[PDB]
């Protein structure tokens, strides 16, 4: 305990000693405190006047208006740990089989920050930084910490610490541990347009209804067993690596120190051994990692391999290995896996009902009570997953199209947000640009964002740049990326013949687009598209005598 987290926590009071309370009133129960001291969205203009009729609707205006962590995790029984500490060893080896773990490199670390001391990019270009990296690394290979602490206001950490966890973990992300060819369940670096096609294919798999449980607070409920299987991926590195690796493990992920602003105004310098602390990308990788083997576990329950999680017999035991070795893979690639996101089609509808397991990992699932079987979905079409779901759509040409999609409203309110503040005009157009190309790329069947893209791009000049997969992000034409996006690089598309216009590529029926929130039908609706090119004008004055493109005609109702 202190032995790990005094050193870091001594530091921090003599810089402070000067303010340094052991407030006796502090609210924590769960997390230790150790001390405390003194300490003390925005809307995009061009976006929101293309999108007139959205002015008067709450869900799309409230959006831009404005104790879980505190509590404890019964420790797992002892059969439910040998099942996670078997199927742990059995994943990492899997993922492994074709992938090499090694450092990443203050030169990655450096061209990342600089593609995203005031800024972190004048900092990567301070040798004195670099030295004090080197001095906590090399306090790291004696199993030491001064400098890696947790700060909040999800905790960012000091920018040398973020380096020392990518050097060490970088990797998995790097190297795409978490792909669907090296993962089966994973989906890391596919795609929206290319998780519909993965849930389509999973639905072939003979098998019961399609499962998708959220968990709870799912960070939250990160154990530290949890951790000690995460930690497993050290015994596939060597050298330096394995030592560097195992000291992120210890002493940042299964030891954290964190300052957290409270106002009664002081810093409080709290501890905790349990629950998600990490990068959100090494998040995103241990997330999959454990959520995969939870659904495993989950699978093997339903199917009859263990009868009970309080204790596991020898023969249980050889059971689960066998199971694994002679359908994991199988079993994996039934599922489709996004940090604590995941959807499942398992061999049969038992699964439903096997809770005892998933319960007792501490993954309870959110909104249903925690002894009731899961409802299962029998239409991928209605499957969610990554906030989305997926429509089947058919080209004039009887070519498929599967096609993300989600509630318009959630779409256009998200477009109407900036994050952060001091954005030129020229910055905030970039952006809503940036929403426009990503509309026309993955939401083109959406009848009101086909439109208002178009109308976006119409009212931005035309060689400015996009700014904040992202195959929108570019100036190249739309239809060229749409064709190399769902024709080209589509592997679920035999047929390459380029499409000529836009008017070859279809929309959802018009029901189901009211039905996904579309404003077709209204006459604030039919106002705006009649009188597009006038608020089209409204922006293009305000930005000013720049070169402008008019891709209103691409659409057949403007092209006159
Ligand atoms: O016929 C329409 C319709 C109206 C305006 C449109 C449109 C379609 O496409 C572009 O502008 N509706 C609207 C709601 C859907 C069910 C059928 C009725
Ligand atoms: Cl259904
Ligand atoms: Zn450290
Ligand atoms: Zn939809």
């Not at 947000?417 to 929403?435: D, F, H, V």
Request: charged share 30%.
């Amino acid at each position: 305990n202190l032995d790990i987290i005094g050193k870091r926590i001594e530091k921090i009071k003599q810089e402070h000693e000067t303010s340094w309370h052991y407030d006796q009133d502090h609210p924590y129960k769960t997390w230790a405190y150790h001390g405390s001291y003194e300490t003390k969205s925005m809307v995009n203009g061009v976006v929101r006047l293309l999108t007139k009729p959205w002015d008067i609707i709450p869900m799309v205006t409230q959006m831009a208006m404005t104790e879980k962590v505190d509590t404890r995790t019964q420790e797992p029984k002892e059969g439910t740990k040998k099942l996670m500490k078997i199927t742990a060893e059995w994943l990492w080896k899997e993922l492994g089989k074709k992938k090499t773990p090694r450092m990443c490199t203050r030169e990655e670390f450096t061209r990342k920050v600089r593609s995203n001391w005031k800024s972190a990019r004048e900092a990567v270009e301070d040798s004195g930084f670099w030295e004090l990296v080197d001095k906590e690394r090399n306090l790291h290979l004696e199993g030491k910490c001064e400098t890696c602490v947790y700060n909040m206001m999800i905790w960012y950490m000091w920018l040398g610490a973020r380096f020392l966890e990518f050097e060490a973990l970088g990797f998995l992300n790097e190297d795409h541990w978490f792909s669907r060819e090296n993962s089966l369940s994973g989906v890391e670096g596919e795609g929206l347009h290319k998780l519909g096609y993965i849930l389509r294919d999973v639905s072939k798999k003979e098998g019961g209804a399609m499962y998708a449980d959220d968990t709870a607070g799912w960070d939250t409920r990160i154990t530290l067993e949890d951790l000690k299987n995460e930690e497993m991926v050290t015994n596939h590195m060597e050298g330096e690596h394995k030592k560097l690796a195992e000291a992120i493990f210890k002493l940042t992920y299964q030891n954290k120190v964190v300052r957290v602003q409270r106002p009664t105004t002081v810093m409080d310098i709290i501890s905790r051994r349990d629950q998600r602390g990490s990068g959100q990308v090494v998040t995103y990788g241990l997330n999959t990692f454990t959520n995969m083997e939870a659904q495993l576990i989950r699978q093997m329950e339903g199917e009859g391999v263990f009868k009970s999680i309080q204790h596991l017999t020898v023969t249980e035991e050889i059971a689960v290995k066998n199971w694994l070795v002679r359908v994991g893979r199988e079993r994996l690639s039934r599922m489709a896996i996004s940090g604590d996101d995941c959807v499942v089609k398992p061999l049969d509808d038992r699964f439903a009902s096997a809770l005892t397991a998933l319960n007792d990992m501490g993954k309870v699932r959110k909104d249903i009570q925690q002894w009731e079987p899961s409802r299962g979905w029998n239409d991928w079409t209605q499957v969610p997953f990554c906030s989305h779901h997926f429509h089947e759509l058919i080209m004039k040409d009887g070519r498929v199209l599967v096609v993300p999609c989600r509630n318009q409203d959630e779409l256009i309110g998200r477009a109407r947000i900036s994050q952060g503040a001091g954005w030129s005009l020229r910055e905030t157009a970039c952006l809503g640009k940036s929403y426009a190309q990503m509309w026309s790329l993955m939401y083109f069947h959406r009848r009101d964002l086909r439109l208002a893209a178009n109308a976006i791009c119409s009212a931005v000049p035309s060689h400015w740049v996009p700014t904040s997969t992202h195959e929108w992000m570019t100036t190249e034409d739309m239809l060229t990326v749409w064709n190399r996006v769902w024709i080209q690089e589509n592997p679920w598309m035999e047929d390459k013949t380029p499409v000529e216009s836009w008017e070859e590529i279809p929309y959802l029926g018009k029901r189901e687009d009211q039905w996904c929130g579309s404003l077709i039908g209204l006459t604030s609706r039919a106002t705006w598209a009649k009188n597009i090119q006038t608020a089209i004008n409204q922006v293009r004055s305000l930005i000013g005598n720049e070169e402008y493109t008019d891709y209103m005609p691409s659409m057949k109702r403007f092209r006159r």
